[PDB]
Design a protein around this ligand. Structure first.
Ligand code: NI
Ligand code: NI
Lengths: 109, 110
């Protein structure tokens, strides 16, 4: 929810909004792509447990995919934070940082 | 809701099942706190780094990887707990537990 709390947290001029809108679509593609992997991995866990409620090679395999998809989402969200930052004018960025830093510090708790 | 909290609410236990699962539930709860601790420490590491140099530094790359690991750890740790809890259940009560488990998980496939 770092993406959510940062989204529209700082002002944006006309040209900043349009660039950050393109970056948002790129993020949306990557996110939906990871989200699909997560969904498929869950579906296979469903079949596995419904077949045999034990930690089978099926369960382990799907779990690693869930693990990887979970981690990929955290990295993708952080990368987008910096990508969105790079789309700001070199005088607006410190305002973006202060919200980001606090959002992390209040999450360090 | 969370799968751990979906199950905890949806499939109820008897008096004996709760007393039996008490030790294991406390074990998982403290395992979760350890991972939560790791996550918080990772976030403060990112906060301190960006404040020094708002960039993708080695400090940022390392902390992100720590976040990536802890996020994955929680998923596995939760799943292991799900099976551990299932073991301490009466054989008769397991289909209900399984039903909530499979359904809650099936929702995560859509
Ligand atoms: Ni965004
Ligand atoms: Ni539990």
């Amino acid at each position: 929810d770092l993406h959510e709390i940062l989204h529209e947290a700082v002002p944006l001029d006309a040209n900043e909004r349009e660039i950050l809108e393109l970056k948002e679509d790129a993020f949306a593609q990557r996110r939906r792509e990871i989200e699909t992997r997560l969904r498929a991995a869950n579906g296979k866990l469903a079949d596995a447990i419904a077949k045999n409620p034990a930690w089978s090679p099926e369960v382990e395999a799907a779990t690693q995919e869930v693990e990887r998809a979970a981690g990929d989402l955290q990295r993708a969200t952080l990368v987008h934070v910096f990508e969105a930052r790079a789309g700001l004018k070199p005088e607006h960025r410190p305002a973006y940082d202060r919200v980001l830093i606090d959002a992390l510090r209040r999450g360090s708790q």
